[PDB]
Enzyme design. Structure first.
Site, short mmCIF file in Angstrom:
data_model
loop_
_atom_site.label_atom_id
_atom_site.label_comp_id
_atom_site.label_asym_id
_atom_site.label_seq_id
_atom_site.Cartn_x
_atom_site.Cartn_y
_atom_site.Cartn_z
N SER A 45 37.19 76.54 -53.82
CA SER A 45 38.27 75.55 -53.67
C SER A 45 38.09 74.57 -52.56
O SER A 45 38.91 73.65 -52.45
CB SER A 45 39.63 76.19 -53.62
OG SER A 45 39.91 76.85 -54.83
N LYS A 48 38.34 70.95 -53.63
CA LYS A 48 39.59 70.22 -53.83
C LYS A 48 39.71 69.04 -52.91
O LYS A 48 40.41 68.08 -53.25
CB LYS A 48 40.77 71.18 -53.70
CG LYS A 48 40.79 72.25 -54.78
CD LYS A 48 41.93 73.22 -54.67
CE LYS A 48 41.86 74.33 -55.72
NZ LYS A 48 42.89 75.28 -55.50
N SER A 105 46.36 75.49 -52.39
CA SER A 105 45.24 75.85 -53.25
C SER A 105 45.71 76.16 -54.67
O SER A 105 45.20 77.06 -55.33
CB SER A 105 44.36 76.96 -52.69
OG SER A 105 42.99 76.73 -53.04
N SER A 212 37.60 80.53 -51.97
CA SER A 212 37.07 81.88 -52.19
C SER A 212 36.81 82.01 -53.68
O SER A 212 37.28 81.25 -54.54
CB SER A 212 37.92 82.92 -51.54
OG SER A 212 39.24 82.83 -51.60
#
Ligand code: K
Ligand code: RU
Length: 263
Positions: A45, A48, A105, A212
């Site tokens: 992530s 992002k 997230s 993760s």
């Protein structure tokens, strides 16, 4: 050469059992400390940031873009949707989606950013446009987090990511307004206190994005405002040999502590 900081990072890595990648840019002197800086790692992530920044770039030529409603449908929910699940059968704006993706997230939110960019390749195209020849986004969430060793999909290098995060947050890849919005979003992250943050002195300010995935993959990318010092950009990427390995956010904290002590 191997520098004293690199030697410490290697000792940390040896005791973790995984593979650690670090890149620091110190903007006091525009220099770089690298540990496996040119090896590829799965971003998870942390990618992002690139997607949100690409939408911010689009907004420079569309002043209402961030207020644009996006429909959230029950079928859009994926594995981790703390914000978007509240808005099913309703709408969220691209600002709301960007904030949810970065600060919480939210994977549904990330997927709406990706769709706004025309798919994973649109995120890669923005990377290339801002001088990052290394980043690649190949999949949506959550499969971008499979983190399989040796797989090139959804990877970058620490060097490339540090250099992109500088350009985005401290440099001129985005307009003034947009860069400030990105920094505000990163500083409001909710997920980062156990990662880079945990290795730094309390007085230092952090804005970051974690990631993760499988293989115990544990990542963080941060901008840091140390007490009394010009800002830093720090990327810490960690991945392990077994698919089911446990996250190690303490290893990221330890890497950050070594970097802080080495300035
Ligand atoms: K995991
Ligand atoms: Ru050296």
């Amino acid at each position: 050469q191997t520098s004293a900081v690199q030697q410490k990072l290697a000792a940390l890595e040896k005791s973790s059992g995984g593979r650690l990648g670090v890149a620091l840019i110190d903007t006091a002197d525009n220099t770089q400390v690298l540990y496996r800086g040119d090896e590829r790692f799965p971003m998870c992530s942390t990618s992002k940031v690139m997607a949100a920044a690409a939408v911010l770039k689009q907004s420079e030529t569309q002043k209402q873009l961030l207020n644009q409603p996006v429909e959230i449908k029950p079928a859009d929910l994926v594995n981790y949707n703390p914000i978007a699940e509240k808005h099913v059968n309703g709408t969220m704006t691209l600002a709301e989606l960007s904030a949810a993706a970065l600060q919480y997230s939210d994977n549904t939110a990330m997927n709406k950013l990706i769709a706004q960019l025309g798919g994973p390749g649109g995120v890669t195209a923005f990377a290339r446009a801002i001088g990052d020849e290394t980043f690649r986004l190949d999949r949506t969430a959550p499969t971008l987090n499979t983190a399989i060793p040796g797989d090139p999909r959804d990877t970058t290098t620490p060097r490339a990511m540090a250099q992109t995060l500088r350009q985005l947050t401290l440099g001129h890849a985005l307009g003034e307004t947009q860069r400030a919005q990105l920094v505000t979003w990163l500083k409001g992250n909710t997920t980062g206190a156990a990662s880079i943050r945990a290795g730094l002195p309390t007085s230092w300010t952090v804005g970051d994005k974690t990631g993760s995935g499988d293989y115990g993959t544990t990542n963080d990318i941060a901008v840091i405002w140390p007490q009394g010092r010009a800002p830093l950009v720090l990327v810490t990427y960690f991945t392990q040999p077994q698919q089911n390995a446990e996250s190690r956010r303490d290893v990221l904290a330890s890497a950050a502590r070594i970097i802080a002590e080495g300035l």
